[PDB]
Amino acid sequence: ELQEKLIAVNRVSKTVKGGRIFSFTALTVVGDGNGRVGFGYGKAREVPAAIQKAMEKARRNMINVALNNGTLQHPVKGVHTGSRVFMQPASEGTGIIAGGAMRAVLEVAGVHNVLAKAYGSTNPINVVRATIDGLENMNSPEMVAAKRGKSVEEIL
RNA sequence: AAUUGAAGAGUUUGAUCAUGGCUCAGAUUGAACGCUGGCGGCAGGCCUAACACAUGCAAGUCGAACGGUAACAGGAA
Ligand SMILES: [K+]
Ligand SMILES: [K+]
Ligand SMILES: [Mg+2]
Ligand SMILES: [Mg+2]
């Protein structure tokens, strides 16, 4: 049901009296390929435990995306920290034209055709947050019609 | 029918986020070099010395403008 993807594993370190203590971090995303997506970030002493913590957090933090037949509704911009991303709907057969971190998010969410570009910092943790922030704020003609007090047909 | 279009990665720190340069993956060429080399089609071939040039060839034609006859070819001797 849920597609899981491991985006990045990093080794971090803190210093103590006896020397350095290493640990690992894991960044993952989960999604149902139909408009739901979440990301999790886990820390542990061993890689497998870090990944399992991340998968566990991701499943509890999914948001909803209003997709339009495997693509976006309109161009969107997302921002988080140094990361600025841009995404655009594309025609069928285009595929996912996106960088590695944006690709994992877009794919587990069910986006099949999209043109994307990451500006600024490409740190994966912040690119994922910016991507999901762009998808979560995307509007559909339904909600645009509702808030404006108009029918969908007068919108399109 | 004739705008179907947009990917990142490495490297500063014990580790982090940012900033910021450097480096890489692409496409291209009147190319050159190294190794190698079967055939065909279409194109392309002094980018440097507007340096100096042997030899041959690259502009003639008209006798229906004209006086003519060097030919050679006939007509006449
Ligand atoms: K270095
Ligand atoms: K850089
Ligand atoms: Mg930058
Ligand atoms: Mg020349």
* Cα atoms found within 13 Å of the Cα of residue A144, Cβ hemisphere only: 13
Give the DSSP H/E element, type plus range, for residue A127: helix A124-136
Are A56 and A76 found together in one domain? no
Ligand nearest to the backbone CA of A122: 3
Number of domains chain A is built from: 2
CB A26 within 8 A of CB A18: no
Is the residue at A155 inside a domain?
A: no
* Rg value, chain A, Cα: 18
Q: What is the resolution of this structure in A?
A: 1.5
Q: Quote the ligand 1 centre to A7 CA distance (angstroms).
A: 24
Determine how many CB atoms are found less than 10 A away from the CB of residue A122: 15
Burial A19-50, CB ≥16 within 10 A → b, else e: eeeebbbbbbbbbebebbbbbbbbebeeeeeb
Domain hosting A28: range is: 3-63
Q: From the CA of A31, how many Å to the C1' of B53?
A: 80
